[PDB]
């Protein structure tokens, strides 16, 4: 029923303490409303636990994201919209790890350059809400780090013990993804046989067979000539969790720096990116690579201010700007943002989020996304970058290794009536096994010279 843990370390450098305290004294949107004394007790437990990631892996990610920023690699970021403790199981994790590897080999062939793989995993347990009371009149579900999905009042109370449950689930998952990435799942030939089974059994396989066959000949060629790292990420939302997981280490200049060891990279969402808020200030104090989500109310001028605050030393790949405009708005809204930022001399990664600007409620009462709109935003994103001569750096996608019925369309041609089949997401609709693979194939075509 309950685990019991008793409460009964070296100080930070004086300047890092001052800066951390100042970041956390700024106002913060979307925080849990639990008591400060209970939060503090939970953070004290987390301050001594083994970290989810280590500094050397974060420094290595930074070097790989620098190549992406310079136009010599591509970033694939993907996973569940919301991880749940309930589905934090071996089959679910393996299914997502495999999906990401499958998409990555397809994208690598299309881009003709390395693909950096960042999973939404081992921490994606918190979400923001526009309304604190939902459609059933209950306090809103804010992810398993905060409260329960169950539609009852007791379940929806904010519960600080979920910080520690979140850590435990994150460690366990990350342990498995490390294991899985040094196993036979690694092998590029095994990973691509899955894609060819997908081509054989998919209703739209004829659309993708030529490209699947060409990839298979590239792999066999490589072998005829004599011839896996998955990073963890989540939205840095709950500051009690992120601050508890900070650790001091010597950074890429040999001086002690603060690393958030809850993940390798984190991003700041649309509702928490206040320029003078705690999330942006917290991002300025940590050594991790960071991303900021940019929606349709973004100005070129605010985008530059984010770049100058978050990438003050002009470190290629330290900052990612994640575009989510809507498929009908991206072609008009993005170019002015890109031009103004390019002119600063900084090298950010431009990443497309084709999911969050394109959501709508179906007549059957399910929030859903159409495949054609998702594809069209990624396409428009590539067009904006071709015209300006800039690098389309990656995609940020929400997916699952399960055959869910959540997003409309694809090869399966999922309808409004089919959405009830198994709509399993705890939050936003995921592209299923098939639809995620389809998009990787379509984006690989977009990447071709």
């Amino acid at each position: 029923w309950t685990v019991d843990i008793p409460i009964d370390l070296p100080p930070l450098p004086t300047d890092l303490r001052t800066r951390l305290d100042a970041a956390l004294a700024k106002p913060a949107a979307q925080q849990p409303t639990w008591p400060a004394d209970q939060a503090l007790a939970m953070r004290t437990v987390l301050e001594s636990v083994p970290p989810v990631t280590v500094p050397s892996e974060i420094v290595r990610l930074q070097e790989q994201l620098a190549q992406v920023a310079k136009g010599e690699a591509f970033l694939l970021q993907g996973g569940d919209c919301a991880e749940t403790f309930m589905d934090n199981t071996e089959p679910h994790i393996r299914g997502n790890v495999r999906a990401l590897l499958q998409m990555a080999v397809v994208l690598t062939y299309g881009a003709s350059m390395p693909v950096v793989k960042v999973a939404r995993i081992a921490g994606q347990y918190a979400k923001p809400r526009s309304a604190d009371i939902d459609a059933l009149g209950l306090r809103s579900y804010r992810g398993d780090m905060i409260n329960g999905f169950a539609p009852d009042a007791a379940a929806r109370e904010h519960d600080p013990s979920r910080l520690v449950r979140a850590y435990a689930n994150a460690s366990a998952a990350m342990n498995l993804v490390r294991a899985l990435t040094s196993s036979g799942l690694a092998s590029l030939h095994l990973v691509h046989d899955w894609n060819r089974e997908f081509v054989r059994t998919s209703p739209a396989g004829a659309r993708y067979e030529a490209l699947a066959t060409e990839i298979d000949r590239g792999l066999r060629f490589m072998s005829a000539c004599g011839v896996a790292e998955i990073y963890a990420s989540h939205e840095a939302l709950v500051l009690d969790y992120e601050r508890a997981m900070l650790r001091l280490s010597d950074g890429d200049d040999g001086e002690p720096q603060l690393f958030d060891l809850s993940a390798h990279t984190v991003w700041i969402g649309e509702r928490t990116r206040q320029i003078d808020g705690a999330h942006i200030a917290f991002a300025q104090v940590i050594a991790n690579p960071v991303g900021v989500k940019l929606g349709p109310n973004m100005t070129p001028e605010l985008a530059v201010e984010y770049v100058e605050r978050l990438d003050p030393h002009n470190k290629p790949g330290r900052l990612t700007l994640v575009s989510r405009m809507g498929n009908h708005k991206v072609r008009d809204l993005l170019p002015p943002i890109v031009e103004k930022v390019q002119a600063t001399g900084h090298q950010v990664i431009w990443q497309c989020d084709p999911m969050h600007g394109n959501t709508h409620e179906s007549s059957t009462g399910f929030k859903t996304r159409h495949f054609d709109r998702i594809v069209d935003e990624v396409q428009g994103f590539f067009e904006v970058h071709r015209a300006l001569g800039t690098h389309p750096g990656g995609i940020h996608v929400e997916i699952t290794g399960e055959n869910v019925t959540e997003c409309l369309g694809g090869a399966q041609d999922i309808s409004e009536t089919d959405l009830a089949g198994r709509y399993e997401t705890a939050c936003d609709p995921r592209l299923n096994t098939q639809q995620s693979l389809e998009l990787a194939f379509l984006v690989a075509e977009m990447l071709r010279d």
Binding site: A206, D372, D376, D413
Partner: protein, 79 residues
């Protein structure tokens, strides 16, 4: 000399095919431009699947002919 006569026919069939392919691309463009001015997407996934499916009687190369016709109509992706 049945070969010259038969090659004479293939020439006609190629002029005929070429002309229907040029036509199809212009019509394909006009459908894309109308949908886009009206706020719709560039491509329609389900419709491209219909187009692929109706060249399947040619065998394995049928889908590659359809995909090639789609490229002539709506262009290459991400361009």
């Amino acid at each position: 000399p049945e070969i010259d006569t038969l090659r004479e026919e293939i020439d006609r069939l190629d002029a005929e095919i070429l002309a229907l392919v040029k036509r199809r691309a212009e019509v394909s463009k006009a459908i894309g431009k109308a949908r886009m001015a009206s706020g719709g997407t560039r491509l329609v996934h389900s419709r491209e699947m219909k187009v692929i499916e109706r060249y399947s009687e040619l065998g394995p190369d049928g889908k590659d002919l359809a995909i090639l016709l789609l490229r002539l109509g709506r262009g290459r992706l991400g361009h």
